[model samples]
Target: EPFTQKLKIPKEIDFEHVAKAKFNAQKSLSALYKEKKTDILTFQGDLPNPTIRIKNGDDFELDFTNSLEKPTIIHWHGLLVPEAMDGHPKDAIATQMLKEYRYKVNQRAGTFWYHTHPHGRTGEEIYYGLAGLYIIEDDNEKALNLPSGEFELPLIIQDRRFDKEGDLIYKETPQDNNGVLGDVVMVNSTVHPYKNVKNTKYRLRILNGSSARTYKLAFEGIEDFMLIGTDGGLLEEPIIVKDILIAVAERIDIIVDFKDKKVGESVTLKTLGFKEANNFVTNPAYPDSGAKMDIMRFKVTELSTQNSQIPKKLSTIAKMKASDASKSRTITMEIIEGGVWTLNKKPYDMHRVDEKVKLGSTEIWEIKNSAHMAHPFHMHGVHFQVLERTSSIDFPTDKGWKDTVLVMPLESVRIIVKFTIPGLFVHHCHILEHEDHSMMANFLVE
Candidate 1:
């Protein structure tokens, strides 16, 4: 049950300029990310289309046109918006021919994103180039006065596959239960697209939109990078560290001051290679799997003339604690032997709303993954702070507010989330294949 009809992509050098998005759907009503048709949208010809930039507390407007024959809606995930535009769980409207979505952006300053949010069809749509970055800048961010333009930019990290015809094909075949991910990597829609370093300090905003792949990020040539912000926004103080593991739908902001890169030198934006992460190597679960390699190529191709200034400190964070939570809820999971998946042990019932919370209430939600495989959990319409993981998030990289968290098998993770806006939203696996198989649930706020 493909939400949208399939369009055969033509092969040509120009094909690089246009990538197909959207995927085939088997269980039309029971699918979100599972079955999809790769619907192509041209975005200045770059991976993830050079970030859909915005500002904090600003009214961001979106004109989502269902360019294909199928109906669709673009939900700006992680950004706070009015009910009608926030990709309301029940407001997902699908149609053939032309459908329009007018959305407004109203949220804190940080790294957010956009993807298909049509009720049960989100997963597949998002898999098909339906995802991109939505950045919000504010006085606070400006106060920090981080690098800009050529020196500072956001990275939209995603994995994709092109069929023999060289068109992006989004499909969740029976073989792709956890989700489909091609070893090939693309950042901001282009591989190896880098700029010259004016200074060593460069701001990087990372959003992991891959359906299931979790990125263990590392600099191929450099030893480290400075982390300035987390999922929700800037941290109270910046933390410098090596390798950061970004789960699906999560975002991390860092400043890399390339003081060492001389003119005509090069480096790469690598994923530190995870074969277990993709099944292209070992076990599909990636538990205890050891092989890891580089995901992107980064080359510092030019010389810099701007001031080489690195801020001593950047951004401040107001911590949201578990004790400050006004409420707590349990999110449990179950993996069907060969059937549908479930959240809180049941499949998604579009007509039903599982949990409800009051507006502006800070709450702690516990997600326990009993399923045999790793599940990257996500919530629509809101952002959250990852106060603690049941076990150790050991590295300094694991700290911050996030929209997605990967729960390893048998691990129960706790997150502190505040219900700021009132509306119905979804919580489920970032894995489209599992999502299509019924591993999804919705929570409503009145």
Candidate 2:
């Protein structure tokens, strides 16, 4: 069975925006053939996680109730919220606890997300299905007349492992600390599922929601898709590419047209697999062991008169100049002898504030990855522009607003950001396993 649905985010009406969030234990009610009917941990009893949509300038409120045996907290990834509402690991409440998230929607419109961020538990919790997509929309993006309604699809790509009976397995040993790569690929929590697509243009909001896996996504035997957005939001113009690499926790928005496919025809959306890079990858402890896998199948089910044209211009992104930076910091990634990941040679400490920035200060952060693998560096509570990568221009497509950028082996990635949010925030390697193991640090802005 295929389980897919449009993500719905709440809106503020009459000066009120409220919703209830709960962490519950449940089972996969819609498993596909030969797939184990596994038990899962979820929010709101939904699988693959829920897609939340909220308009800008709304009051957002969430009453989170945790019922699991383990502690839980939620990090609004790529969102610029206050420290108290950020769901930092230090702010995690114990199990059977209730926490209220209250905030006024004042961040940029983008494809944000929410997932587990509890210290040392993010990998297991997220792998068990405690993640969801949060989309912040504004009037500018709405005026573009992009594909909406049923034509809009949210693809949450993930890799999972299971035992013979199909129970989800996340048995972490000393080796998995590098990052876990499951042999099985799943989209929206379904194993090798198929979707019936109308012969029309569809906007695909794809997310690399895997715990540690990075995906080199490509359409098998097709290259007609146009990339329109990234982690931050819509790009200035549509970028046509043969393939795109999406790191864990990163989002990519693309437009795909199925007009050429006749009814009953099908195409495979697949991953080209991953290769371990010298000097650093997701983590240094593990080697590249990814195999090519078919993510999902799209079957042409019906013909439609709708022919959505790609918009020439998507959104206006104000550029932050490096010359305006008031300060700069160097972040180094490495694995200590005991297999602990660290930023700047120090492991994560709850009481230690690694870096401090003055509020509304423009700064340049040069992230250096010297390990034998690549690390996707991610920052919370703010966004940045990819200034340069080592010595190449348009190197890795660092042209738009982004919150996560992959610092390849022996590469130095520079990003400029103007910190405007107050309170404590995290900047860390996005590989959840690495992050959970101590590759995260805190920054205080006051």
Best by TM-score: 2
Worst 10 residues of 2 by lDDT: 5-14
Q: List, in order, the clash count of every candidate structure.
A: 38, 10
In angstroms, how far off is 74's CA in candidate 2? 0.9
User: CA lDDT of 20 in candidate 1?
Assistant: 28
Candidate 2 lDDT, 1-446, residue by residue in tens: 33242223222122324354344433344342254456677776657666777878886777777777877788888887888889999888877788888887886667778887889989888888888788888888888889988887777788877676777767456667777877667777667667788888888888888877778888864556888888988888888887888888888888888888889787788887767532233323333445577778888889899967887988777877888998999999888768899999999998789999999899999999874677889988888998888834233347678999888778898899889888888899988889888999999998
Candidate 2, residue 17: Cα displacement in angstroms equals 9.2
lDDT, residue 250, candidate 2:
86
For residue 2, what is the lDDT in candidate 1? 16
Q: What TM-score against the true fold does each predicted structure earn?
A: 0.81, 0.91
Evaluated at residue 399, the lDDT of candidate 2 is 64
* Global Cα lDDT for candidate 2: 0.77
